Amino acid sequence: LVHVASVEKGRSYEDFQKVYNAIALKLREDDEYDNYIGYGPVLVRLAWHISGTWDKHDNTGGSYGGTYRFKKEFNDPSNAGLQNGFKFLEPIHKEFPWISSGDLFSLGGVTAVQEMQGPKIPWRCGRVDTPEDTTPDNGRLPDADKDAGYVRTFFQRLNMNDREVVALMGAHALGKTHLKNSGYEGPGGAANNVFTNEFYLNLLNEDWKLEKNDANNEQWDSKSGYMMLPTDYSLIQDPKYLSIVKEYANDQDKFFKDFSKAFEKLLENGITFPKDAPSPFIFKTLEEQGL
Numbered sequence: 001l002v003h004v005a006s007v008e009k010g011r012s013y014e015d016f017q018k019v020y021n022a023i024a025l026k027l028r029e030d031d032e033y034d035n036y037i038g039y040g041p042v043l044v045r046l047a048w049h050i051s052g053t054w055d056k057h058d059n060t061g062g063s064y065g066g067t068y069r070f071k072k073e074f075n076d077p078s079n080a081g082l083q084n085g086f087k088f089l090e091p092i093h094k095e096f097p098w099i100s101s102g103d104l105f106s107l108g109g110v111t112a113v114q115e116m117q118g119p120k121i122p123w124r125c126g127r128v129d130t131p132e133d134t135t136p137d138n139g140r141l142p143d144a145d146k147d148a149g150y151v152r153t154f155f156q157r158l159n160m161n162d163r164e165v166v167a168l169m170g171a172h173a174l175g176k177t178h179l180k181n182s183g184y185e186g187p188g189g190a191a192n193n194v195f196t197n198e199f200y201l202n203l204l205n206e207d208w209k210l211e212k213n214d215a216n217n218e219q220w221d222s223k224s225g226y227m228m229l230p231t232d233y234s235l236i237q238d239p240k241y242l243s244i245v246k247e248y249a250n251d252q253d254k255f256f257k258d259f260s261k262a263f264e265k266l267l268e269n270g271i272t273f274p275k276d277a278p279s280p281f282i283f284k285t286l287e288e289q290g291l
């Protein structure tokens with residue numbers, strides 16, 4: 001099963017920077033969402049979930065086909081809440097109808113990370129919509145109530161190693177768990193709409209207690225009002241993960257560089273890029289453009 005990137009006809013860097021900018025401008029404008037967290041975190045999560053269905057063994061799932069637009073995937077219990085990100089992107093897609101669904105969903109994630117002051121994430125165009133029967137079944141996204149061995153094995157299916165897993169998980173600095181979506185409640189820290197290495201700092205520095213939430217699920221809580229999922233906390237229970245958590249807690253730049261690599265890889269898993277494909281694009285932020 002081969003998915004060849006095909007550039008939207010006649011489009012180039014400038015066209016995608018316009019789409020970036022529209023997303024970024026709406027991120028700034030629609031600031032009220034989720035008690036003023038804004039849409040950044042949910043857009044990052046959407047980009048991850050549309051990519052995280054990939055299976056390296058047979059190249060099913062993955063961002064290429066844009067299949068989140070079909071009800072089977074839209075309604076995956078694992079994706080509860082992401083409809084808010086999709087709705088955000090609707091007017092963007094209406095303005096730029098030429099962009100593929102997979103390019104739009106993944107570009108939303110890149111735009112959110114950069115506009116939240118995260119690392120630059122190189123991004124490649126050319127995902128092509130595929131039909132409804134290519135939508136992957138529910139159940140390929142990870143459970144949160146599990147341990148380090150679960151996490152490690154899970155991410156092998158996405159061809160991610162320990163360092164890539166721990167780097168990717170730093171995105172959990174962003175946003176919050178919502179009890180009605182996932183059966184977990186609370187943010188992971190104070191800086192949850194700016195992209196930093198706070199996830200690692202808080203894992204190491206907060207005093208965590210294993211409590212039950214109102215949905216009768218266990219989660220790790222701090223007196224400062226933060227929470228970690230069991231799978232988050234597993235990163236400091238496993239000795240190999242813990243070393244890498246300490247590394248990123250002590251080196252912001254290294255976290256940024258490793259996140260950027262792992263996130264681009266996640267977003268590109270399953271896609272074959274022709275040798276004569278354009279190079280990856282690095283979009284300017286609104287701030288860099290004076291916009």
Ligand code: HEM
Pocket residue numbers: 041042044045048080081142143144145151168169171172174175176177178179181182183184229231263
């Ligand atoms: C073991 C892997 C992971 C598990 C079990 C997991 C689980 C969760 C769960 C349960 C939530 C809360 C959803 C809700 O209640 O609204 C969440 C939120 C989120 N996740 Fe993860 N996740 C994992 C990996 C990742 C990765 C790799 C990324 C992206 C690089 C990511 C990005 C996010 C973001 C940004 C949020 C906040 C969303 C919001 O505030 O609306 N997650 N995740």
